Amino acid sequence: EPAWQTRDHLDDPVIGELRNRFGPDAFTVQATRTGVPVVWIKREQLLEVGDFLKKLPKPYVMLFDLHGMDERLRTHREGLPAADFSVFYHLISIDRNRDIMLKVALAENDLHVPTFTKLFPNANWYERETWDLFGITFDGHPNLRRIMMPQTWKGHPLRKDYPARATEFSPFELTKAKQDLEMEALTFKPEEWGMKRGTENEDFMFLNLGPNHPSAHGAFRIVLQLDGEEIVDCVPDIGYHHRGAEKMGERQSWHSYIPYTDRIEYLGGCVNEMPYVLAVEKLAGITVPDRVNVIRVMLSELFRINSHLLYISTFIQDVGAMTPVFFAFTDRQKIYDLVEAITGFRMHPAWFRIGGVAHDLPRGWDRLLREFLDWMPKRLASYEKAALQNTILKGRSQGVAAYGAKEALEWGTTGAGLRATGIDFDVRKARPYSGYENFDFEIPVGGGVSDCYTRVMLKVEELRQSLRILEQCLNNMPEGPFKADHPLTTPPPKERTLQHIETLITHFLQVSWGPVMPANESFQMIEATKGINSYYLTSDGSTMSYRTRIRTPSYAHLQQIPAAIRGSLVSDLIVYLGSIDFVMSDVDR
Amino acid sequence: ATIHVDGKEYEVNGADNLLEACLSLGLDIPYFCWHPALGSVGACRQCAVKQYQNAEDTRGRLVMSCMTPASDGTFISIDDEEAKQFRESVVEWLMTNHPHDCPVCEEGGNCHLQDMTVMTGHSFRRYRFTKRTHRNQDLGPFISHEMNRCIACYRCVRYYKDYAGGTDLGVYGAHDNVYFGRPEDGTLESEFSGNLVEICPTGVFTDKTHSERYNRKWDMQFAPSICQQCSIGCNISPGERYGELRRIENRYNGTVNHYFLCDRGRFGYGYVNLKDRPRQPVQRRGDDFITLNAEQAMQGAADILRQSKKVIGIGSPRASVESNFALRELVGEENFYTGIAHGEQERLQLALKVLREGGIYTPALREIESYDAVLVLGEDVTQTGARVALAVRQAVKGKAREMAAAQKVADWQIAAILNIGQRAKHPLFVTNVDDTRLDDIAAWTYRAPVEDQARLGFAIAHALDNSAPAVDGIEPELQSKIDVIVQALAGAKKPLIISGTNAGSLEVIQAAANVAKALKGRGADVGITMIARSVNSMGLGIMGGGSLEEALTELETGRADAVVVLENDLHRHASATRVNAALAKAPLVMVVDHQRTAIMENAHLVLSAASFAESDGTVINNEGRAQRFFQVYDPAYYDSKTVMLESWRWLHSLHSTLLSREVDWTQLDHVIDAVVAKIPELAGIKDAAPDATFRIRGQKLAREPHRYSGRTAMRANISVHEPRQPQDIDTMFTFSMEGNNQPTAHRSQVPFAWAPGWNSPQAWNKFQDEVGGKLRFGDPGVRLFETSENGLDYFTSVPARFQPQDGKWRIAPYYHLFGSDELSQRAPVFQSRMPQPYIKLNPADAAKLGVNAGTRVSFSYDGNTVTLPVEIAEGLTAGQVGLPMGMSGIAPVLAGAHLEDLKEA
Amino acid sequence: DFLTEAHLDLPMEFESIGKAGSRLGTALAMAVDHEINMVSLVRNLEEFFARESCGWCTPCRDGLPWSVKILRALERGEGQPGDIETLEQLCRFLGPGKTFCAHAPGAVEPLQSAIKYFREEFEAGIKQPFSNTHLINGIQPNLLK
């Protein structure tokens, strides 16, 4: 039985516990291709269900995702409660290694849900995002304001009636009045945040760290309330890097959305490509062969080494040593030589396809892979012994912005931070995707404290394990097809397209109108370069995505930022920013 | 009936087969040879499903869902493994000989064969041998032929012969060398041959007019509109690309024009893409021709209109309801004149009085196919209202349909129906000045002058009911034919009487009304159908006004020093010399038109109006249905200096500048509400379409498909900065793909049909409640008037017998589907299809004059000694000259007129 | 359907020949000796049946020439793997009820009978490997396993 089959998920013990707790007429179970039990629950019992899941013997301790969905345009809703809007809550229990997805149905006029922030503190930014893009109000939320759009924005962009393109609206006319109005909108108002901008002894200092700061890894701004050098409170202001990629997912075909998936986490590349194409293959019912899995593992581990090299060099640069970034980018250029050879592009390859990859491996890729595998470990050991074993770097890093497993779980922290708290939870081992079971590699974990130094050394060990994976896949690569034999493989193989009429017809209708994926819900969760990246795709049975929800780890890390750096100095914040491994396309999407 | 599809219980209609029942429920079964209009023949063998007779049955039997009735207690499986493999094998067998032609095929992206190859999931080729090839034929200027792409599904021949009644298309050849076409090269002379490009699931028959300037279906910007080439008002989907009208697709209206258009309405759209059209307001200063924008044109026009003592307005039946009303409200009630002549207006008002006061229900075009005995009086339907002639052919085959239904044979078994009803058919009696194209199925054809046709109609009315006025002087053989017609009409259950204003006589319409009244008096379900001339003739008749002669004499006597002509050439309804003298004598001629007419030399100001592809409006068709047509594209998006607006917008802003000295661009709903407020008889045009505030769950209706391409590059030669998409404040549509085009949306105006997996015109299946039936959530357009409680009285003005006077020749009209329309003949593709101007003569009259066939004779009408070559017409009665109406220099107003000095020159 | 020597001691009734996987037909039997190659005989039969099609319905019209060309390849020794399986699938998908009339089931009965009884003659005509494509320089082909 294939793993993409629509599973009703009535064999999960969490469903039985929910039946024995709330009764058999309290919820509906939706059969999806997510691999996760989807439970439609009533709005009145949402907090009780959340408390019951939090108080389980092996509880669901993490809020993975929280977002809305416009169901007004969804034609195929058989077996679902009647809804104009819906809110889904994706929760993870690491102890059971299980997920659940609670869905709440809302009418068009009664668009209010009880807040989830008391059960999970990381729900704050998710609820602000759901209010900003869908207009759904959360009762009891502390500060429900726009988080992706500026405060002087009319309408909610992820609603179906909102226009997706900039050409629908008037072209961007920057006048003096508009500049003044948007500058007053962008000015930080501490009375809105309850910052209390003064003390009897002295005055607090309000500083904009970002958008134009060397320490900020993008266009975002942390507003710091300071006394002298110490941070009293922080307001991380995001939404400056919003590209509307989910609304773009509603606007492109299944095949033509792959380059947009590539730019979600621009240091990730094929790592960003994999969850989307895996979810689309779950929707289509495509089981890719072994060679496709090994090639995709190759490219994603190569890009993981690339991203980790950039992260380590960036951390060393923000600590103060400006030398190893040059050599780390030289190693990045070696990886880029291999990636240019394979995919034809440097940093956004867009090489993964539905059912396979764009081309076969060119003749001679193993020579460049062997060159990189010989070049890498001496350079990495040099970086370690030159900067990562530096006592000044250790003084700037060890003990700085430290949190335990409780803070990592309550804020949805994934990736190197969660493993640095001692929780051994990696997606490539817990829920193995793309044939990662065939590769012998270790998962580094920490001692229980998630320092800057601990996260950086964990990423160094992850780089070494990725080098081991690359060596294993270089020594054993299958000799088969680079595309699946499914009819929904988009696009079909090129030579058959160029000389057969069936293949020409399939190519013609798949690159123009798009592949028709039948109406189902799919979900794929992978271990990204910066944490856990997930794609949740709702298909309406058409050639375009009805809903594309992208869960990213940098969003959770930036929401965790005020709770881990409050009371510290600004230097600790600089090291914390350099040691988080975030980019801002990842956050704002 | 109750069926079980894949274990799911469904309630279907037991008189339908399994294919249309399952397609109505939304179940996707592949099919080629079945069409909702043609029937089931079981040719392509693509619709296979596995049938079980019991709920507990494992083996089953592969049957054809198109040939299997949807009886109660049938358990069918569509996605069973055996059925799916057989359907994939049928697609594979069709793919063995199919050419590698999809990039160079006009049907690519609109192909049913592509959609069904993808739907069955066949994408691997194991056939390694050669593919058969075919030569191609020249089918004329409209249809391009590519025989290699054929799958031998027999849809073309079934439509063209068993539906359209054509005679030059057929199947030839053998085992796998089947050819579909003509026995030689030549033009397909059926008036409905253009539907072959949508009937054919492959790219064999393609639109050559669209193939000249070809774009794909996703690149097309569509709109729902009404065809403006005659009075039937078929719903069309005009689609444009790069600022020019590319294609006219069929728009499904289950009430009017369900699957089929006529060739004039499908290939006569080329006048929109003419380069001589006015694109700006142009003002004449002596010999100089200066160009204004909208504001200066309004200010100058209002200044000269205020500096005049009386302003009159000449409308047109070519204009919409709103533009004619805006002219009427600009110039006043008493100063508004309809652009048609006095006789044309008299015939039009008589036809309207018969329709909305005669007490006889006027059927819709779909309902014409259900009437038993058809009597056509005076109308040449196949050349003026051709789609009505197609529905008349269907009503004629209704006899074979009922005879096969008497033998417990299903409705969809079209081959068995044609086998049982071999040549027996419903009675059809056509009267004309000559032979018609309905004569192959007509029970009788009466070739006579219009006076004698009217006398035969009055004799039929007198023989059906003795209270009708009698006509004395009928020959005994004609009396025998009349009593044959009377016995056929009296024995019918639903008789239909079809007349119109194109016959050129009032007494023909009076005789048709008397026949309908006599049939109603016997207790019969009689229907009557008047065929008007232009698209909005009935709306102009309802709104009313003076004739063109009254406006001409008002200009000639000097009481009118300002004339506003709305979309009229004025040479079609009156003599060119008198019109030219009247417009030259008037000191201000202001012409709102979108086509370069001949009266623009004398025009002091020309307003570049918008055609149907660039304007919104309402048109009233021949049966009194108000239909809204929507704008397809904004003309100023590509060409920035184009100032081309709606004619009602022109005239409303002109009246606002006349009154308050302010330019006011209104909205379509404001003009609509003005019509409903001022004219109570046009009150139904408000409900023809919903207003601009209508939304489908908050979003508008998309004019283009969701895969519309080239957005950031289609205007990059002008400027690299892409402008905002044009905003439609008039309608509920948007000039973008950011909108709704779902098959399950609660609307009646569908711009185009597309569904996931259905890119062909078979995508209209998803937009109907049942396939081949009504559109889902009702058809667009509402009827203006209902059938009255009481009817008219008998018209006692029986005309005298036509006596051929010496010297004077009565002009017999000869209408042509290609040539007799004002705007269709301006299309460049119609030049190769329009017949040469030939004057038709009797052999006896030509022998008296010494003329043989071919040579040229000259006749003078209103000081115009024009010379035409002579064609001998045996069926034409002596004393008449046959002239082609609507040609160059021969107006349709010439019908019924005299002709002096007919000499060989 | 072709029958063997063991079927010769069978009465010539409809139900007796029908039970043994054949048809009585017109009861005018035709004998095939050992010198007659059965692939050539079935090729001649299918050539007659394909060229005497009426062309109304898809499976006979566009699948009998496929069997004809497969048997021409097998006659000349240019058969490729999958051809006999294609013939078997054609026999299964041209049976009673699949086509509009009964010309095609009677067409494909000798083919399936010959494959059932004399498969070794059909397998002997498969000499070259399967090749439907040709090499396009610059595009690496998808090597399905």
Ligand SMILES: CCCCCCCCCCC1=C(C)C(=O)C(OC)=C(OC)C1=O
């Ligand atoms: C000039 C000497 C070499 C400099 C190399 C810098 C490499 C990247 C530094 C990290 C960084 C990233 C990724 C980054 O995205 C960013 O935001 C725009 C920064 O602030 C300016 C950064 O500092």
Ligand code: SF4
């Ligand atoms: S008819 Fe259809 S399948 Fe055939 S070449 Fe044209 S687009 Fe392709």
Ligand code: SF4
């Ligand atoms: S030409 Fe077109 S409609 Fe006619 S049989 Fe061939 S595929 Fe069918």
Ligand code: SF4
């Ligand atoms: S019958 Fe008249 S309205 Fe219909 S398509 Fe032809 S010209 Fe147009």
Ligand code: SF4
């Ligand atoms: S099976 Fe019969 S109906 Fe079908 S094409 Fe062959 S001979 Fe004609």
Ligand code: FES
């Ligand atoms: S659709 Fe039934 S056989 Fe063609």
Ligand SMILES: [Ca+2]
């Ligand atoms: Ca408009």
